[PDB]
Each structure stands twice: as structure tokens, then as C-alpha cells.
Amino acid sequence: AELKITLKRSVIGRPQNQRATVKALGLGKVNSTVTKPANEAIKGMVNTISHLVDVEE
């Protein structure tokens, strides 16, 4: 099923790939909720920035 995503750690000092994962998911300011499907692409992005993010089923 879909997953909720929230930034919990800033994009400052973090590389462009992580910053672009955030822009692509569609998140801006921290503590920003977004909802996505459980695709392998988005799970890979979440594994790319797991330290930056909290998630929910």
C-alpha cells in the first residue's frame, strides 16, 4: 500500500543526489508530509535518504 514520508533532517550540507531525491519526491521544508505508492523506485529513494526521513505504511 501507499507510504507517508516526512523529512526529519535538513538538506543542507547534503549532496545533490539526496537533494534531488527530495525535490523529486516533492518535499520542501522539513516535517513535510507527502504520500506515494510502494514502488521500487520510491523505495530505493527512501533507502537512499533513510537517514533524512521517517516513513509510515
Partner RNA sequence: UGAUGGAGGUAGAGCACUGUUUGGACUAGGGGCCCAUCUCGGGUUACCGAAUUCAGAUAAACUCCGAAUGCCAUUCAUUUAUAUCCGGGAGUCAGACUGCGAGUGAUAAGAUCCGUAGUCGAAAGGGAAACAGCCCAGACCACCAGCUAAGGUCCCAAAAUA
Partner RNA sequence: GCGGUCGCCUCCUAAAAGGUAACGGAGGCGCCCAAAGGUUCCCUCAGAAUGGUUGGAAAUCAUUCGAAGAGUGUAAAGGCAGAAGGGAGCUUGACUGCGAGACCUACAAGUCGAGCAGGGACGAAAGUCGGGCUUAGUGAUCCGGUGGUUCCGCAUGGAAGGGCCAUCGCUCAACGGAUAAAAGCUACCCUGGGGAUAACAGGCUUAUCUCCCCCAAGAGUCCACAUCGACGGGGAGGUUUGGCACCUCGAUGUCGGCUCGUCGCAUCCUGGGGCUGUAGUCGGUCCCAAGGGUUGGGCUGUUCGCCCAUUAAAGCGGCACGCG
Partner RNA sequence: GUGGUGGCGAUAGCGAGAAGGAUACACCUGUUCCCAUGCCGAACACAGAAGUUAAGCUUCUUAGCGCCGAUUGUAGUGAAGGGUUUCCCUUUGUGAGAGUAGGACGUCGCCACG
Site for RNA in 14-33 (CB under 7 A): 14-18, 21, 23-26, 29-30
Helix or strand or coil: residue 24?
Answer: helix
Type and span of the H or E element at 6: strand 3-7
User: Which cell numbers hold the place of 16?
Assistant: 545533490
Q: Which three cell numbers stand for residue 56?
A: 509510515
Contact flag: residue 53 with RNA (CB under 7 A): no
Cβ contacts of 51 within 8 Å, gap of 6 or more: 9
Q: Which of 2, 4, 9, 56 binds RNA (CB under 7 A)?
A: 9
For RNA, the binding residue among 33, 41, 54, 55 (CB under 7 A) is 41
Which residue ranges make up the site for RNA (CB under 7 A)?
Answer: 9-18, 21, 23-26, 29-30, 36-37, 39-45, 48, 51
